[PDB]
Amino acid sequence: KYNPSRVEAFHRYGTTVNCIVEEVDARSVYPYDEFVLATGDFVYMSPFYG
Amino acid sequence: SHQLSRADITTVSTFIDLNITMLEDHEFVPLEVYTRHEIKDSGLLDYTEV
Known part of the structure; x- marks a missing residue:
């Protein structure tokens, strides 16, 4: 994590970006209009949409 | 005249037949x-794994 350099008696802001890629297993149930990922995040679209 | 074996003369049956067979083991x-694991897997999300 990037934190701002110390300057006495100041409020300082610091930004950090971490680009993350993951492989997850997604599960869907009948009638297969939604599927949820391994992280507990739903995706509201049929797995077979195209 | 002569001797004869027992089998030489035809025999009529004076016994009534009764046929019983045992029950097979x-x-x-x-x-x-459905097993326990299949029933557990039926759920879409598991709080513990997530």
């Missing part, structure tokens, strides 16, 4: 429609 195997 049978084995019952463990058989379930």
